[PDB]
Design a binder for this molecule. Sequence first.
Ligand SMILES: c1ccc(Cn2cnc3ccccc32)cc1
Ligand SMILES: c1ccc(Cn2cnc3ccccc32)cc1
Lengths: 141, 135, 138
Amino acid sequence: SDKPVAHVVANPQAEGQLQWLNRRANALLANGVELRDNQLVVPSEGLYLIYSQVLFKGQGCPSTHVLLTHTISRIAVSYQTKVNLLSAIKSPCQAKPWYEPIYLGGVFQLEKGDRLSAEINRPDYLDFAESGQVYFGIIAL
Amino acid sequence: SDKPVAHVVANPQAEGQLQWLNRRANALLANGVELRDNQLVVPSEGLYLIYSQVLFKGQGCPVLLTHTISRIAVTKVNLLSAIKSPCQAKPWYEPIYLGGVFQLEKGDRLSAEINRPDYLDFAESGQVYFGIIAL
Amino acid sequence: SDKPVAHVVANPQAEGQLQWLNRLANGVELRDNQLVVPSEGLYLIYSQVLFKGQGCPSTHVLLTHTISRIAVSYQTKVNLLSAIKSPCQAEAKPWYEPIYLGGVFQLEKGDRLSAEINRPDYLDFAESGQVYFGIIAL
Ligand SMILES: c1ccc(Cn2cnc3ccccc32)cc1
Ligand SMILES: c1ccc(Cn2cnc3ccccc32)cc1
């Protein structure tokens, strides 16, 4: 004990970005995890549960189809290795509103100093109507 | 173990509601967590892993499905929320998952809610639950 | 002696099965494709499975994932956690559908937990950090 954990939420006031915040109520950084250049920094080696959710919302279907992506990536200290951990793609269009959440999660072996990022392609479709709809977090097992 | 924990399941005999049940097998409340007015009451300050799952089931497409966990510290403030559009007479199944690590205080009341209990699927045990685990 | 724990992963060479591979701490033994509880207590049970299909054959494509308890006292299979998914809602596009399961349960010495799927033909042994099963004693 005690286990490194983090749960960061998107800043709804940050236009055209997916900006992670830990300095708002119901968001945290604990036992060594850090938020640096919009990335979570792993404090110690071990098995981590990495999780993320983004809610996309559009107002109808415009010309052809829109692609929505959400990716979690890991940049390591050794060899500055840039690996891609979890990724998902969605085509919401096939004027009434649509809602498309993207979930990303898994158990990974991480090392001290690994920097994890949770990114999207279209921040214009990001939904911040209410709180708790878009978050990113890691839990040490 | 001294760690406060809870794993509550939906009552399949509750009409048009998502009613959490604790003492109805494989479900529990431990080390101070109490189930009051369909809310889990946090017994002590600390880091908690909050989790939830709801399974929605419809028969064809005639619709928005939502599932929210909210905190009321000692008006609800959403911790975790998700929205799903299952319709874009074959049946559809749509699970909604909610979870994360939160800093909670003694007396905080957590609720796990849905907008349409008519689409809720509890035909099988283990298909709709809500719990908290102290870290 | 400290805290029984386990994290198993699907065997990528076992085609047509969800076979859990070992390498399991402080007594949590994977005995018959099942995790065997070594002592009484509160356990956090977790699981994930990734499904992948090549297109849509019909809307009758049902995907399930279930964690079951076979209690050492009664000896009957009961669902602890379960979830169902309908991935199918021309040049067929591949689809990916993960299923997540987890919770805190009171388990007894000898209890056997299994993590099963209905269609192993749709299982995607490619992501790895995505098809797993584990328990952590609290
Ligand atoms: C406890 C309750 C539920 C869960 C659900 N869960 C299982 N693997 C996951 C990966 C990412 C996010 C959630 C995940 C885990 C632990
Ligand atoms: C992916 C899958 C599930 C989720 C939401 N989620 C449900 N149980 C969880 C337990 C721990 C963390 C996240 C969890 C988010 C992203």
